């Protein structure tokens, strides 16, 4: 009843109580990752994925 937010194993906040209702929301971080370019040799084609 008194708890306002929750944490993952290593410090990071992973859930919050909405202060107006009582709902508990999980937080997922922004989607992110490496852009990687898959290519034949430029000697044979210029199409890439």
């Amino acid at each position: 009843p008194f708890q306002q937010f929750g944490r993952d194993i290593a410090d990071t906040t992973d859930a919050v109580r909405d202060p107006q209702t009582l709902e508990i929301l999980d937080i997922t971080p922004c989607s992110f990752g490496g852009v990687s370019v898959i290519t034949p040799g430029t000697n044979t084609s210029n199409q890439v994925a």
Binding site: T12, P29, F32, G33, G34
Partner: protein, 50 residues
């Protein structure tokens, strides 16, 4: 938190096919699949060899 984990190139299912292949070569053909094509030999005679 800016950290990313990348998958292995070979899945656990693909590794389990290679460990089945090495095992099925070893059972049916002794060491011969390490020298060339697998040559079948009866398993009692492969142990008689070993």
């Amino acid at each position: 938190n800016g950290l990313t984990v990348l998958p292995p190139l070979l899945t656990d299912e693909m590794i389990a096919q290679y460990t089945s292949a090495l095992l099925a070569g070893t059972i049916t053909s002794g060491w011969t699949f390490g020298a060339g094509a697998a040559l079948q030999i009866p398993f009692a005679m492969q142990m008689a060899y070993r």
